[PDB]
């Protein structure tokens, strides 16, 4: 018997299958197109996530040889903030999905800031005025369609995040729900009252009619035909969960398309004074917990950039090798604000920049610097978490696709002067959802049943280069400050 | 003017003063990796003047490009790391002279790097000079001596492997 | 019968052979190593320029089939500022050649500025305090050798530029001369009194003993055995000359390793108030004329960077193709201050930077931006010349290796909103020296004998995109300002 | 509210007003490429409102990405270039609407781009709208009309090819 998890990420759509003993049985991944219609805009095609996600399922089940008969449940994880609008009759989008990365609604945020909502929005959403979240994306959509709002008050139009979206497409239009994690991300939901914010909804001209049903991250939402879908959670939270985040002061760092660092604050909503978000996570039964999040838009994606647009590498994996043919970046720094700067910076105007170039700098210098931005960004966040939380991490737990890079991991350790523990199974985001789902179905009963699959494959400890860490970081800082505010308005 | 040429008086693991001055608590080095013995454990040394030298016979590992620090591996299988001062790398190699090369075998006392205690005195953030064993894991006991020490002469630590 | 010219450049060493009718008969080029011992330092190996230059000669003569018997003279052109010191007995350098690009003596310049010499140095040298010129390079050398000054007062040590150097190596140690053009570049020579500046020499602790003999750019300096060497001139000036610079208000732009824009001011030394140099050129008989120069360190060299270190292209020629697969740089800008910024900026602290990057920017965007910096830089200079000189160019005459790039030429035209005339023979720098030499040997008698080999192969005229030119340039400006002052002190 | 649907009154080379308003001297366009007729020669037009249209039957060449200008080639072999305002490209396409596409054949009067004269009125550096022939070289005579003009209706220039 088994649970099946669905992780639908920025980059790709996956499908993992574990057993009762929570063992990864088979996986299916399928990449998909990123669309950049312009400048710092990002977009995905709803039908393609859909298509991509579906297909992945099948092929996993088929792969392993299993049927509708042996699968206890369906756990669902997904990319956050990314907004979708869609005609209810049809099951057709009215626009392409707008990505968390996408910077279009920057002006709108400027109004909000102009108006005075910062204080409000922070306080109730835990969020920060930025095009990063859902709110402004929706408005922009209804604002960039003739028959929009109106069609939507009459409710022919549904809003939703990749979880809501993926769900509805499987509950064949039946079920229109989001979880608690997902909703927080929106800028429209209130984290204390645990429901849609009346003010936001107004201020942004959104129609309660389009908002789905907000529910627990472990609950049977419904049943689908490959059976019941019982878990839901934003990818970052699912990973915090599969890491066994779960208890106060517990923290992880995920290295994927972006970097998201989260720390459980249990039942206290801590107010960040250092550029972090206050958001929702799960407690050991999948219940509402609060947390501190530091989001960094570009991490692994820089590598994909080298690999796909610059064409400096064939595989991302090749980056360790080239990076280490070098010893130093020769002075070069890479600020990867390709889609603005996230925490703790939040400057949607910043754009990517390379620096400190001279004639002897070559491709390896460049690749490796790229890799380094990853550590540096992490470090910027970490410091913030420490300040906000008063706690000093002694080790950093990590997961994500990039964590297979020993160079980066080690570099990460030196740069922070902290140990780095690299978990045995990297596919933790999935794991998270599975539990949430299995738990909810009596598949597991207890989280404790699992304080065992979480083996530590490796510890990285600070080398002697760690002494140099503050000089290097200062570079970084200098650099960053100069990519800042590139774009205008 | 230098007795460099001249013969000198010649007198468990003992590590020798690689540089001279007063011994200090790693715990008081104004840098956590040190103080918390994250990089390893050892002592620190406020300094005498003129130079840094091998603290054991072994082979010289890395010599930081800005020649303010280096490491070495003893024939005994210990790892030492000598880092001059704190954040010195920002002087960009100004005060330092590479007498040794990233790869040779040395004996205690062989010169390794040379320095300008005074330029370093006012430029540097700090002049403390940590001396730590990086491979703590591979050593049973580690003994910390005290007070005054002289290059290539006084021992700073004893260790049981 | 024929003249033979020797062009020994930043990048390579060439040897051209023309006939009486000043027709390029045969050429020999040979690239050579650039050494970057560190940061923004550049260096060449004296023995290699030498070696490279020699060899090139032979092989040209051999190529065409000619002997010591049919060659009227030897004309010599070379890279400027690049300083060399060498033991007189031996014929051996005491250090590697320090390049015009090299930024080592930046501190020294800071003293000079600290002291109060700007005003002085400008006034007498026409130059600007910058590591670009010879002065500080020499000091640094004698300062970074034990037995230096001393050995040199006793004169066992010779100073010299690639002309002086190449000469002495051919007059077998006999002849130790520089021309008037070359010497101006030094920061030690006085342009009004037409001789070594006593103050400079002091202030910089240099020994008159090492200084060579300063002479006319057309004169028989001596004879060598492959016969007499009769021409000498800094490459930029030779090109101005072979363009038939020659008369007041006449201007050219050379696109090579760097970009040098020069304008003849006849017998008036015009004081620049817009970041340009006042220097020496030739009058129609090879006589001393003054001129305005705008120097830009990186032009074609950026392309070599893409080609050799970044590895984005096989040949520099391939850059037109890729650049034009694109329409726009998508927002990207490349500030190629790999070796500081020259005119009118003069910031030896600036370092190269790339900007305005987002995820859809690719290699072609990058290559083409590189190409664009070329135009932009030109334009910055040009504007300066216009302000300083009160004259408005209506066409820009050009030469250099990069001028074979129709994309860049056109782009150049649009960007300036000025016509661009591309001469039929690009190898004008050579041509310049030949004349200077042939003239001096009665090979030609008159410059007029030649107001005919200077055919215009192409005119580039402003396209409709020219309307956009100021928006684009503003980018550039923004950009530039941010690469500024990267390095510290 | 728009008679867009409705039939209208329907009346050497003549170029038709591609946009409406008062005719002006190229010489007075505050941009040298224009004033000095570097890009070409033609006239300018202070403007009416609402839109820009084909000034000859021909084929539409480039349509600047920020849709403020375009060019076209007449069946007669002339090249025109219509550039709305000065430095407009900085509005980044704000006020503009691409009705046509970089490649079709048009007749005089066909809509080409649409605009918001008022947004453009206060945002733009200038609203003058140059209308020039880029291929001057290929034309013998070029005649400049004057005063008031109306889109798709009044001729601004006559030329002999
Ligand atoms: N060895 C590696 N080094 C660096 N990046 C890697 C490596 N292997 C894979 N990747 C990178 O890791 C990311 C994939 O991580 P994943 O957790 O699957 O991210 P996501 O959930 O956003 O899809 C990519 O951005 C990718 O290009
Ligand atoms: N088609 C081209 N486009 C751009 N750069 C070119 C092209 N062809 C050659 N080059 C570039 O032109 C320069 C060579 O010009 P040259 O006048 O020979 O310079 P130099 O005198 O400094 O040696 C190089 O920097 C080179 O890489
Ligand atoms: O904030 C958005 C995150 O959910 C992105 O997650 P991802 O890197 O796995 O696509
Ligand atoms: O100012 C130095 C110039 O002489 C460089 O000339 P070059 O580009 O031909 O090497
Ligand atoms: Mg994921
Ligand atoms: Mg040259
Ligand atoms: Zn250090
Ligand atoms: Zn424009």
| A86, A191, A316, A411, C120 from A199: Cα distances, Å | 23, 13, 45, 45, 69
Give phi and psi for A208, each to the nearest 5.
-40, -20
Nearest to C427 by CA among C5, C1, C2: C5
Cβ neighbours around C245 below 10 Å, total:
25
Question: Final residue of a domain: which of A212, A243, A274?
Answer: A243
| Residues A154, C144: Cα–Cα separation, whole Å | 83
For chain A, how big is the Rg over CA atoms in Å?
21
Kindly determine whether residue D83 and residue C464, on different chains, have CB atoms separated by under 8 Å. yes
Give the β-pairing of C177-179 and C213-215: parallel
Instruction: Say if residue C262 is preceded by a cis peptide, omega within 30 of 0.
Output: no
Nearest ligand (C-alpha, residue C10):
4
What ligand has the least distance to the C-alpha of C102?
A: 4
Contact B71 A462 (CB under 8 A): no
Q: What is the bridge-based pairing of β-strands C251-255 and C395-400?
A: parallel
Q: In terms of domains, do C102 and C203 share one?
A: yes
| D56 CB neighbour count, 10 Å cutoff | 21
Yes or no: say if A437 and A229 are a contact pair by the CB < 8 Å rule.
yes
Tokens 């503050």, residue located: A470
Residue A456, judged by CB atoms within 10 A of its CB (0-12, 13-18, 19+), counts as exposed
Q: Domain containing A204: what range?
A: 1-243
User: Which of C8, C9, C163, C336 to probe ligand 4 with, by most ligand atoms within 8 A of CB?
Assistant: C9
Where are any strands of DSSP class E within C162-258? 177-179, 189-190, 195-196, 213-215, 218-223, 228-234, 251-255
Contact A483, A335 (CB under 8 A): yes
Pick the catalytic residue from B47, B63, B80, B83.
Answer: B83
Ligand 8 centre distance from Cα of residue D129 (Å): 11
Q: What is the CATH number of the domain that holds C306?
A: 3.30.420.40
CB distance from D89 to chain C under 8 Å? yes
If DSSP codes are grouped into helix, strand and coil, which group holds residue C145? coil
* Number of helices and strands in chain C (H, E): 15, 24
Residues C237 and C248 in one domain: no
Q: In the beta sheet, which residues pair with residue D44?
A: D24
D neighbour chains, 3+ CB pairs within 8 Å: C
Q: Report angle CA C278, C283, C289 to the nearest 5 degrees.
A: 25
- Count of structural domains within chain C: 2
Residues of B in contact with A464 (CB under 8 A): 39, 62, 69, 71, 81, 83, 134
Q: What are phi and psi of D115, to 5 degrees?
A: -145, 165
Quick check: do A and B touch, 3+ CB pairs under 8 A?
yes
Same domain, A343 and A479: yes
Q: Which of D39, D64, D87 sits opposite C466 (nearest CB)?
A: D39
Q: What does the alpha-carbon distance between residue C318 and residue A428 come to, in Å, rounded to a whole number?
A: 46
Torsion of CA B87, B89, B94, B97, to 10 degrees: 110
Is B62's CB within 8 Å of A470's CB? no
- Beta carbons of D38 and C417 less than 8 Å apart: yes
Q: Is B136 on the interface with A (CB under 8 A)?
A: no
Task: Decide: B82 and B129 in contact? Cβ < 8 Å.
Answer: yes
CA-angle at D108, arms to D102 and D111, nearest 5°: 55
| Alpha helices by DSSP H, C275-427 | 300-305, 318-323, 363-389, 406-416
CA gap A165, A210 in Å, rounded: 12
C73 is written with which tokens?
A: 């003279």
**Burial of residue D6, with CB atoms counted within 10 A of its CB: 0-12 exposed, 13-18 middle, 19 or more buried:** exposed
Give the span between the Cα atoms of B51 and B59, in whole angstroms. 18
Q: What burial letters (b/e) apply to C402-436, b meaning 16+ CB within 10 Å?
A: bbebebbbbbbbbbbbbbbbbbebbbbbbbbbbbb
Strands in D51-53's sheet, in edge-to-edge order, are D51-53, D111-115, D96-98
> With an 8 Å Cβ cutoff, is A201 touching chain C?
no
Do C93 and C181 fall into the same domain?
Answer: yes
Domains contained in chain D, CATH given: 1-161 (2.70.70.10)
Chains in contact with chain C (at least 3 beta-carbon pairs closer than 8 A):
A, D
Cβ contacts of B57 within 8 Å, gap of 6 or more: B74, B75, B105, B106, B107, B108
Single out the residue of C3, C11, C6 nearest to residue C400, CA to CA.
C11
Bridge partners of residue D106, in order along the sequence: D58
Asked if C311 and A356 come within 8 Å (Cβ–Cβ), the reply is no
The encoded tokens of residue C153 equal 């007062």
How many Cα atoms are found within 13 Å in the side-chain-facing hemisphere of C73? Answer: 25
- Is A457 in contact with A422 (CB distance < 8 Å)? yes
10 Å Cβ neighbour count for C249? 12
Residues 6+ apart with CB under 8 A from C369: C329, C332, C333, C334, C354
Contact C328 D31 (CB under 8 A): no
| The domain boundary residue, chosen from C243, C261, C282 | C243
* Cβ proximity of C433 and C238 under 8 Å: yes
Q: How was this structure determined?
A: X-ray
C462: chain D residues, CB-CB within 8 Å: 33, 38-39
Q: How far is CA C29 from each of CA A265, C16, C80, C100, C432, rounded to the nearest angstrom?
A: 70, 9, 18, 21, 17
Residues 414-453 in A contacting B (C-alpha not used; CB under 8 Å): 417
Q: Nearest-CA neighbor of C118 among C383, C280, C420, C346?
A: C346
Q: Does A464 touch chain B (CB under 8 A)?
A: yes
| Residue with the two structure tokens 């033609």 | D42
Which of A217, A243, A269 marks a domain boundary? A243
Q: Let me know whether C270 and C346 are in one domain.
A: yes
Sort strands C456-460 and D13-16 into parallel, antiparallel or unpaired: unpaired
Q: Give the atom of ligand 2 at the shortest distance from the alpha carbon of C303.
A: 27
Distance A400 CA to ligand 5 centre (A): 7
Same domain membership, residue C223 and residue C97: yes
Encoded tokens for C460: 């580039």
Dihedral of the CA atoms D17, D22, D23, D29 (nearest 10)?
-120
List helix spans (H) across B60-123.
119-123
Which has the closest alpha carbon to B86: B104, B63, B68? B68
Mutate to test the interface with C, among D39, D68, D89 (most CBs of C within 10 A): D39
Are residues A224 and A299 both part of a single domain?
Answer: no
Whether A272 contacts A123, CB under 8 Å? no
Q: Do the beta carbons of residue A151 and residue A157 sit within 8 Å? A: yes
| CA dist., res. C353 & res. C482, Å (int) | 8
- Count CB-CB contacts under 10 A for residue C393: 17
Rg (CA), chain D: 15
CB-count burial class (<10 Å; 0-12, 13-18, 19+) for C445: exposed
Neighbours of A200 (CB within 10 A): 22
To probe the interface with A, which of C313, C358, C361, C476 has the most A CB atoms within 10 Å?
C358
Nearest to D26 by CA among D129, D159, D149, D143: D129
Q: What is the separation of C-alpha A303 from the centre of its chain, rounded to a whole number of angstroms?
A: 17
Entry field: residues in chain C: 489
This structure's resolution (Å) is 2.7
Ligand 3 pocket test: which of A5, A9, A242 has the largest number of ligand atoms within 8 Å of its C-beta? A9
Q: Does one domain contain both C307 and C177?
A: no
The residue written with tokens 């010191």 in the block is C85
Burial class (CB in 10 A: 0-12, 13-18, 19+), A292: buried
Joined tokens for residue A396: 């950093």
- Is the backbone of residue D14 left (phi > 0), alpha (psi -120 to 50) or beta? beta
Element of type H or E holding C431: helix C428-440
Residues of chain B numbered 101-130 and touching chain A (CB < 8 Å):
none
Structure tokens given for D118: 């008022």
B37 by Cβ neighbours in 10 Å (0-12 / 13-18 / 19+) ranks as: middle
Regarding whether C239 and C251 lie in a shared domain, the answer is no
Looking up tokens 């994880």 gives: A77
Give the separation between CA A299 and CA A63, rounded to whole angstroms: 31
Ligand 2 pocket member C401 (CB < 6 A)? yes
Helix (H) or strand (E) holding D35: helix D32-35
SS3 B35: helix
Question: Which pairing describes strands C456-460 and C419-423: parallel, antiparallel, or unpaired?
Answer: antiparallel
Are A100 and A206 contained in the same domain? yes
**Same domain flag for A113 and A251:** no
Other beta carbons less than 10 A from residue A112's beta carbon: 22
The pair phi, psi for residue B140, each rounded to 5°, is -70, -60
Do residues A475 and A384 both lie within one domain? yes
Query: How far does chain A reach from its first CA to its final CA, in angstroms?
Result: 56
The secondary structure element, H or E, covering residue D105 is: strand D105-106
Q: Is D70 helix (H, G, I), strand (E, B) or coil?
A: strand
Crossing angle of helices C134-143 and C106-115, rounded to 10° = 110
Best residue among A9, A11, A318 to mutate for probing ligand 1, ranked by most atoms within 8 Å of CB:
A11
A235 Cα–ligand 3 center, Å: 6
CA C299 – CA C284 distance, rounded (Å) = 29
- The Cα A253–Cα A425 span in angstroms is 14
In this structure, what is the dihedral angle of CA atoms C420, C425, C427, C432, given to the nearest 10 degrees? -90
- List CB contacts (< 8 A) between C257 and chain A: none
Place of tokens 């021409």: C231
Report the 3 state secondary structure along chain A. CEEEEEEECCCEEEEEEEECCCCEEEEEEEECCCECCCCCCCEECHHHHHHHHHHHHHHHHHHHCCCCCCEEEEEEEECCCCEEEEECCCCEECCCEECCCCCCCHHHHHHHHHHCHHHHHHHHHCCCCCCCCHHHHHHHHHHCCCCCHHHHHCCCEEEEEHHHHHHHHHCCCCCCEEEHHHHHCCCCEECCCCEECHHHHHHCCCCCCCCCEEECCEEEEEECCCCEEEEEEEHHHHHHHHCCCCCCCCEEEEECCCEEEEEECCCCCCCCCCCCEEEEEEECCCEEEEEEEEEECCCHHHHHHHHHHHCCCCCCCHHHHHHCCCCCCCCCEEECCECEECCCCCECCCCEEEEEECCCCCHHHHHHHHHHHHHHHHHHHHHHHHHHHCCCCCEEEEEECHHHCHHHHHHHHHHHCCEEEEECCCCHHHHHHHHHHHHHCCCCCCHHHHCCCCCEEEEECCCHHHHCHHHHHHHHHHHHHHHCCCCCC
User: Strand, helix or coil at C325?
Assistant: coil
Q: Identify the residues whose C-beta falls under 6 Å from ligand 3.
A: A 9-10, 79-81, 100, 234-236, 256-258, 295
CA C380 to CA C475: how far, in whole Å? Answer: 13
Do residues C45 and C59 lie in contact, with contact meaning Cβ atoms separated by under 8 Å? no
Enter the DSSP assignment of B36. T
Chain length of chain B: 161
From residue D32, how far is each of A359, B142, D103 by CA, in Å?
A: 38, 81, 29
**Tokens standing for residue A439:** 């738990």
- Nearest one of A459, A279, A296, A264 to A379, comparing CA atoms: A296
């Amino acid at each position: 018997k088994y649970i099946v998890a669905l992780d639908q990420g920025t980059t790709s759509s996956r499908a993992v299958v574990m057993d009762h003993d929570a063992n990864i049985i088979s996986v299916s991944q399928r990449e998909f197109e990123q669309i950049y219609p312009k400048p710092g805009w990002v977009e995905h095609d709803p039908m393609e996530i859909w298509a991509t996600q579906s297909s992945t399922l099948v092929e996993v089940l088929a792969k392993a040889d299993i049927s509708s008969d042996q699968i206890a449940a369906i756990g669902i994880t997904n990319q956050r903030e990314t907004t979708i609008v869609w005609e209810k009759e049809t099951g057709k989008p009215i626009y392409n999905a707008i990505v968390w990365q996408c910077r279009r609604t920057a002006e709108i945020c400027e109004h909000l800031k102009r108006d005075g909502l910062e204080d409000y929005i922070r306080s109730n959403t835990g969020l920060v005025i930025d095009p990063y979240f859902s709110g402004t994306k929706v408005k922009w959509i209804l604002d960039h369609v003739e028959g929009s709002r109106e069609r939507a008050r009459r409710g022919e139009l549904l809003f939703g995040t990749v979880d809501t979206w993926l769900i509805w497409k499987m509950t064949q239009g039946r079920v229109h729900v989001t979880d608690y994690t997902n909703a927080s991300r929106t800028m429209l939901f209130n984290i204390h009252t645990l429901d849609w914010d009346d003010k936001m909804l107004e201020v942004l001209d959104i129609p309660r009619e389009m908002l789905p049903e907000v529910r627990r991250s472990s609950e049977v939402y419904g049943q689908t035909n490959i059976i019941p879908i019982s878990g839901i959670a934003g990818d970052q939270q699912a990973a915090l969960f599969g890491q066994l985040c779960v208890k106060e002061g517990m923290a992880k760092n995920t290295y994927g398309t972006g970097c998201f660092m989260l720390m459980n604050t249990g039942e206290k909503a801590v107010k960040s004074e250092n550029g972090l978000l206050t958001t929702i996570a799960c407690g050991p039964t999948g219940e509402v917990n609060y947390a501190l999040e530091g989001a960094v838009f570009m991490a692994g994606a820089s590598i994909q950039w080298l690999r796909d647009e610059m064409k400096l590498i064939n595989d991302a994996y090749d980056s360790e090798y080239f990076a280490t043919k070098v010893q130093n970046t020769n002075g070069v720094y890479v600020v990867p604000a390709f889609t603005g700067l996230g925490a703790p910076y939040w400057d949607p105007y910043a754009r990517g920049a390379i620096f400190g170039l001279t004639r002897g700098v070559n491709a390896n210098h460049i690749i490796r610097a790229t890799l380094e931005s990853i550590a540096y960004q992490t470090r910027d966040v970490l410091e913030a978490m420490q300040a906000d939380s008063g706690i000093r991490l002694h080790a950093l737990r990590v997961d994500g696709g990039a964590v297979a890079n020993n160079f980066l991991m080690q570099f990460q350790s030196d740069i922070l002067g902290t140990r780095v523990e690299r978990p045995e199974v990297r596919e933790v985001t999935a794991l998270g959802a599975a539990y949430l789902a299995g738990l909810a179905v009596g598949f597991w009963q207890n989280l404790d049943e699992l304080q065992e699959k979480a083996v530590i494959e490796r510890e990285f400890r600070p080398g002697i280069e760690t002494t140099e860490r503050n000089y290097r970081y200062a570079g970084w800082k200098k650099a960053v400050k100069r990519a800042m505010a590139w774009e205008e308005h | 003017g230098l007795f460099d040429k001249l013969k000198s008086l010649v007198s468990t693991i003992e590590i020798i003063a690689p540089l001279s001055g007063e011994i200090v608590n790693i715990e008081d080095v104004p840098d956590v990796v040190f103080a918390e013995k994250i990089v390893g454990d050892g002592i620190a040394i406020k300094p005498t003047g003129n130079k840094m030298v091998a603290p054991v016979d072994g082979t010289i590992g890395k010599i930081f490009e800005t020649n303010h620090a280096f490491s070495i591996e003893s024939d005994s299988g210990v790892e030492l790391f000598v880092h001059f001062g704190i954040d010195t790398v920002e002087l960009k190699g100004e005060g330092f002279k590479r007498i040794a090369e990233e790869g040779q075998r040395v004996k205690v006392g062989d010169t390794v790097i040379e320095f300008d205690l005074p330029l370093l005195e006012e430029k540097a953030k700090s002049t403390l000079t940590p001396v730590v064993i990086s491979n703590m894991d591979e050593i049973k006991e580690l003994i910390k001596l005290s007070g005054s020490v002289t290059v290539g002469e006084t021992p700073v630590i004893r260790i049981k492997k």
